[PDB]
């Protein structure tokens, strides 16, 4: 039985400081006061660093010794592009990957670029560039040369799992290229030809008997936390679809980030069957979120480790860990204490795609179950009722990566 972490939207707040200005704690946190902060953090604030050490030493604590660790990205801030230049945010990235490597030093890491990881912020071009190439020497230990040449050209690539297995390969998008705020890749059908090279890259897997993990940071489909916010320009998440379903019967299971909450996204076929399966880990960072429509979108920190079969890359479970930033913040040392496991909370035999399947029936059908996963897709931060419109909107986001079918779930 093999284990790996999984992280994501960590968020450093360089600024981040216990001030007894409420307008001067955080730049994360805009113009909202931000009042009684406190060192491990603020719901309004992106994460000080005390919060992102404290993220990486708890997982060292939980198991020291993992199989490796994906990482999808989002280092730097919600700030305004002119207060984060380039140097910034690549000596951020850094600080961050070294961390990892300090806390981890012979652990292989699958590391993804968030949309946030550039300057400006989500401007992730179709071609090599100044961050592509330092992040990539970043990463270098972590990456086969193939990895190095293909991360320098667009910030994607696969790589074998540790160790002499060929059991196995984790595919890293960079799926900030169909983000719809992206214009670098406006125009474009298949941008730094992504697409192409996994179709192949899914099609080499099934010549040679391999599995696939496939990471990224920005899913497609929805966001569950409100309805018709899809990141994905349309003709994107189709072929991510697509692509999906082509080549499930070679991926054990898909992870992503970007939302900051719990969530997850079922694949079916034309058929009607379930076909593959995809976690959305919840972030690091609690900030507040300022999209529209969402109301109180904070959450607790949270980190993942999922357990799985290494020589089928079965996901036989996970488990979410958390820190009760209301708690921590009043404690000597924050002590971060299990979410929940899978298997436990949804009353499944494991995370495989039939499993996530009931799972998902069971949250649409029982109210217990539901409620149970509302609070989880905070991070157990919102405890209120998740009502029929709440309801509506998580089984409808969970069910529905297609833009057609999800609005159509939205219409009952
Ligand atoms: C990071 O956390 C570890 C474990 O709690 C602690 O020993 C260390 O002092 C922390 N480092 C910083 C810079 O806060
Ligand atoms: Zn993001």
Known sequence: ??????????????????????????????????????????????????LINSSLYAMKEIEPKPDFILWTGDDTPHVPNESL????????????????????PDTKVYA???????????????????????????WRPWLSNESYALFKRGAFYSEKLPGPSRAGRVVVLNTNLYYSNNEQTAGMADPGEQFRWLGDVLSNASRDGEMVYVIGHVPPGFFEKTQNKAWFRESFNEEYLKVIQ???????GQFFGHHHTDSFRMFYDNTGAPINVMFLTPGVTPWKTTLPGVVDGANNPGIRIFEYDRATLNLKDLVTYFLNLRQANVQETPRWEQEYRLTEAYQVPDASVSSMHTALTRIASEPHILQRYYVYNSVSYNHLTCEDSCRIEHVCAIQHVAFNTYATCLHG
């Open 1 to 50: 039985l093999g284990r790996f972490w999984h992280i994501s939207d960590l968020h450093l707040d360089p600024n981040y400081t216990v001030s007894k200005d409420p307008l001067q704690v955080c730049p994360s946190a805009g113009s909202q006061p931000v009042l009684n902060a406190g060192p491990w953090g603020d719901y309004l604030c992106d994460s000080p660093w005390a």
């Open 112 to 138: 993804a670029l968030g949309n946030h990881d550039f300057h400006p912020k989500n401007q992730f071009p179709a071609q090599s560039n100044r961050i592509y190439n330092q992040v990539a020497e970043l």
């Open 85 to 104: 230049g380039e140097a910034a945010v690549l000596a951020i990235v850094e600080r961050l990957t070294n961390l990892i490597k300090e806390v981890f």
């Open 246 to 252: 082509k080549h499930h019967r070679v991926i054990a």
